[PDB]
Amino acid sequence: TVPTEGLEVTWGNNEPYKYWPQLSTNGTAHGHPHEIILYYYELYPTMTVVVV
Amino acid sequence: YEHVTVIPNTVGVPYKTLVNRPGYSPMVLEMELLSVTLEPTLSLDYITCEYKTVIPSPYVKCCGTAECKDKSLPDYSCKVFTGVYPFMWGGAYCFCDTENTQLSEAHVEKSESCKTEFASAYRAHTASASAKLRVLYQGNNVTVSAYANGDHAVTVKDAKFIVGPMSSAWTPFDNKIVVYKGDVYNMDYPPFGAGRPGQFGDIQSRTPESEDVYANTQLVLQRPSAGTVHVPYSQAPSGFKYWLKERGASLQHTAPFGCQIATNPVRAMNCAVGNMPISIDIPDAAFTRVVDAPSLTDMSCEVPACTHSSDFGGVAIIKYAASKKGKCAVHSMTNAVTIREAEIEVEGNSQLQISFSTALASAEFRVQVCSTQVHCAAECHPPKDHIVNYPASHTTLGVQDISVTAMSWVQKITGGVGLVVAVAALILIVVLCVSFSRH
Amino acid sequence: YEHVTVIPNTVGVPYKTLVNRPGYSPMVLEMELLSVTLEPTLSLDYITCEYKTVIPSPYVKCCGTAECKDKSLPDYSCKVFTGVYPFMWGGAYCFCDTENTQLSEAHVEKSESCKTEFASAYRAHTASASAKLRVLYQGNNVTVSAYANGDHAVTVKDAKFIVGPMSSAWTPFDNKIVVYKGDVYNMDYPPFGAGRPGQFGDIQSRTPESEDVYANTQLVLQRPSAGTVHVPYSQAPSGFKYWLKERGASLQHTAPFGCQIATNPVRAMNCAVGNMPISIDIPDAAFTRVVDAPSLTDMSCEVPACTHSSDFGGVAIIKYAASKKGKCAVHSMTNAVTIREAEIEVEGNSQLQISFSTALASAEFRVQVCSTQVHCAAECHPPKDHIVNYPASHTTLGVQDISVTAMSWVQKITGGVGLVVAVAALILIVVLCVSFSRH
């Protein structure tokens, strides 16, 4: 799991790989309410399930 | 002219910052920390290393008792074994086969290897923080190399820079530390003169070359096996050689905040913790007068494509009419949108292109070109790739706030309840007033 | 066998402690801090020292104008003066009496004195406290030299000593220090590269030999006087030399808690601040059994003379019967009284003399003399001498507590007024009782 903070993975004697997530979603804003609720839910599931 | 600003303590992220002195056209500096360093102030407690158990030839006396020639050496022991009858290759050593005795003696030292194979136990107090910083100043990249204490001033291209102290005093280092070659470990090591056998520190010395040794190997001499000349002994194995296997992962791999570590000297690096105040004092000769730069009008903005892709995934085209040819500093007033270009060439009536990054689902932002602002509005499409090999440019979203323009649904459902509540309140206050008017 | 106690952090005052182990005669140790030494870990920021100004023979150009060529030297200044007509000893230098110019140039440097006359600005972090302790162990003095931080176990005469950690973090040093020869000052010195004309740090260098001289003397050149070849200049006179005069008092003279100060290396010594845990692990061979030690009995005390003088001004004679000849521990069982003798020799039916120190005006106290107790009691007269050079050898008084015998006035009046209260409450209760019979 790659958290918002980023993940560093080091494999054997290789120099580390760093990985960060980004705002990808299969939903969309700008569509009908169920599209936009799914959009903010895939990005911010803890804060959206609270505020809605 | 003093300007003071806060950059997050994040290495390799270029923070655009805006200097807006009255009577001059705005100046934009791009600042990027190339490295940050925490060198700990460090006191050697002791070396630990490979012990050597030293055993001279056993004295065997025929026909009488030897006795212990007692002496002070780092873990000295000796014992007299009675009724021995040792054989050399060609005969018995002693004359008779009774009343002989063997004095066996042993003690421990540092090995001669302890000058290159040693672990160094240190007390670490607090760090002389340091930085190396790139700034884009007067259209060129310049490297500044301050101590991050807030009290080293570096002067370069006649600008004077003062940096830190960082808003977090945090460090990867604990109060007691051990190092071995390239690796460092946070470690509550035993007191000097107090190590247990076969654990780390069962031999201790104040420096690699010191002649002092404390040792606690529990060397116990044992009776020689009948008809032979050896010295058998029991001892806890070298606690340093055990530790070299049992180490686990050093701080280079285990430390918080994406920290990196090295060992000549034992500095930590690039810890992404808190933020760093940075201050620039820059000369009058750096600025351009507000009338001597181009003055802009007829401003319009288009966004040919936008994606919240961490990498400047948006592009904007701004049309303008400018009073003259010249170079123009460019900035975003909306903190949620960061633009890559720090300054741009301007002439005539024309257009310029900028690249920008944001987490916003509908980028709706104010751009300042030369002293002059335009409003940009766009619809942002999500990135397809789920993870990437670099930290985000831009900054975190308002999350509870700065939802889409298409959050007009929140306005609709707030008004669709709120006018029903307003009618119910109006009705209740009316029938309360007319009924109160009939008592 | 481990024993642990806290002695006050006072140098040169001997403290008794009692190791009251079961099955053995109790052992008394005396120990005395011979020194306590808070050396700070200490990081150099820069040297300051007297600058020199370098002024090459001035270039005079006849019939036309010289020009400045700009250069990087530490506080470089040069200027061109027009219409000079300078004279050598035999006549005018220029052909014409006009159109000539003089280029005067100058820069500052370190003096050649900066190798030996310099004041050094340091940062101080925390103390690696050392201590040196006398201990009276097996009835003779031995010296233990240690680190006062709960590390460093010292073995001497096969007892093992662990000392500290000191119960106070206090130090006379602020985080910013300057030192000069034998003296050291708490001083918030200016940043490196931002020192000011005529104050301390007019010239700054990172180490005594370093070539990276920052200097800010405001060296301004001035027009030569009519007819002469000189180079006049206005400059702020050295802020190092001005600090050597305006210097103030060293920490050696000003520091709290009575501490001494020295500088090679820097230490604060003998601060009378807080208290010190000291812990002893004593080998079982050292103790003598309760059946091997003299059995004192039928014992009683007289106090021939007593003055509460802080210098062992009490004397007491204890009569005893004892079962055998032997060495015998003595201890004061009341904290307000300190006896001098740690051990004595006991034999036959006889008496022993002990000398003691207290602030009490009625020294009533118990003495323990090998597992056996006696009670001492007499009035103590105050001393005549008003002040003395040694610190008080006893501990302090309870002041509101442990008032004298013949304070019994307090009990005489309290057994008056408190019984007048008891009788008035008894009278009120009996009339209340019959007033309830009157319901």
Distances, alpha carbon C368 to alpha carbons B85, B175, B254, C334, in Å? 58, 44, 58, 10
Method of elucidation: cryo-EM
Residues of B in contact with A36 (CB under 8 A): 404, 406-407, 409
CA dihedral B182, B188, B193, B196 (to 10 degrees): -100
Backbone dihedral angles phi then psi of residue B284, each to the nearest 5 degrees: -55, -40
DSSP state letter for B223: P
Task: Judge: A21–B387 Cβ closer than 8 Å, yes or no.
Answer: yes
Give CA–CA dist B200/B177, Å, rounded.
13
Give CA–CA dist B226/C32, Å, rounded.
55
- Stated as kind and residue range, the H or E segment containing C203 is strand C203-204
Residues of B in contact with C124 (CB under 8 A): none
Q: How far is B97 from chain C (nearest CA, A)?
A: 38
Task: Judge: B389–A17 Cβ closer than 8 Å, yes or no.
Answer: yes
DSSP state letter for B289: B
Name the residue facing A22 among B362, B387, B404 (closest C-beta).
Answer: B387
- Which residue from B131, B164, B149, B169 is spatially nearest to B35, judged by alpha carbons? B131
Task: Judge: A17–B361 Cβ closer than 8 Å, yes or no.
Answer: no
Beta carbons within 10 angstroms of residue C220's beta carbon: 12
Question: Contact at 8 Å (CB) between B100 and B62?
Answer: yes
Give CA–CA dist B217/B106, Å, rounded.
12
Question: Contact at 8 Å (CB) between B368 and B356?
Answer: no
- Stated as kind and residue range, the H or E segment containing B243 is helix B239-246
Residues of B in contact with C191 (CB under 8 A): 150-153, 162
Query: How many Å separate Cα B178 from the centre of its chain?
Result: 18
Specify the amino acid at residue A32: H
Name the residue facing B382 among A17, A24, A51 (closest C-beta).
Answer: A24
Query: How many Å separate Cα B345 from the centre of its chain?
Result: 39
Q: Does A20 touch chain B (CB under 8 A)?
A: yes
Chain length of chain A: 52
Sequence-distant (6+) residues with CB within 8 A of B331 are B16, B18, B26, B28, B339, B367, B368
Give CA–CA dist B211/B419, Å, rounded.
90
Specify the amino acid at residue B398: G
Give CA–CA dist B383/B308, Å, rounded.
6
Sequence-distant (6+) residues with CB within 8 A of C345 are C325, C326, C327, C328
Question: Contact at 8 Å (CB) between C61 and C100?
Answer: yes
Which residues lie across from B208 on neighbouring strands? Answer: none
Q: Which chains border C (3 or more CB–CB pairs < 8 Å)? A: B
The three state secondary structure string of chain A is CCCCCCEEECCCCCCCEEEEECCCCCCCCCCCHHHHHHHHHHHCHHHHHHHC
> What would the DSSP string read from start to end of C40-95?
EEEEEEEEE--EEEE----EEESSS---------TT-EEEEEES---EETTEESSS
Give CA–CA dist C122/B91, Å, rounded.
74
Give CA–CA dist B109/C298, Å, rounded.
57
Query: How many Å separate Cα C41 from the centre of its chain?
Result: 16
Question: Contact at 8 Å (CB) between B117 and B47?
Answer: no
Give CA–CA dist C437/B138, Å, rounded.
106
Task: Judge: B399–A44 Cβ closer than 8 Å, yes or no.
Answer: yes
Question: Contact at 8 Å (CB) between B384 and B308?
Answer: no
Tokens linked to C115: 């190798």
Residues of B in contact with A23 (CB under 8 A): 308, 310, 359, 382-383
Give CA–CA dist B107/B212, Å, rounded.
14
Q: How are beta strands B387-388 and C2-8 bridged, if at all?
A: unpaired
Q: Does A12 touch chain B (CB under 8 A)?
A: no
- Which residue from B325, B327, B324, B320 is spatially nearest to B372, judged by alpha carbons? B320
Peptide bond preceding C224 in cis form (omega within 30 of 0) = no
Tokens linked to C17: 């402690």
Distances, alpha carbon B329 to alpha carbons B143, B340, C422, in Å? 21, 12, 93
Give CA–CA dist B256/B38, Å, rounded.
14
Backbone dihedral angles phi then psi of residue B205, each to the nearest 5 degrees: -150, 150
Q: How far is A22 from chain B (nearest CA, A)?
A: 6
Q: Decide: helix, strand or coil at residue C308.
A: coil
Give CA–CA dist C403/C63, Å, rounded.
101
Angle at C279 between CA C275 and CA C283, to 5 degrees: 160
Give CA–CA dist B378/B270, Å, rounded.
36
Structure's resolution in angstroms: 3.3
The three state secondary structure string of B375-428 is EEECCCECCCCCEECCCCCCCCCCCCCCCCHHHHHHHHHHHHHHHHHHHHHHHH
Around C284, how many Cα atoms within 13 Å sit in the side-chain half-sphere? 2
Give CA–CA dist C363/C378, Å, rounded.
6
Task: Judge: C191–B152 Cβ closer than 8 Å, yes or no.
Answer: yes
Tokens linked to C335: 């904290």
Rg (CA), chain A: 16
Around B306, how many Cα atoms within 13 Å sit in the side-chain half-sphere? 22
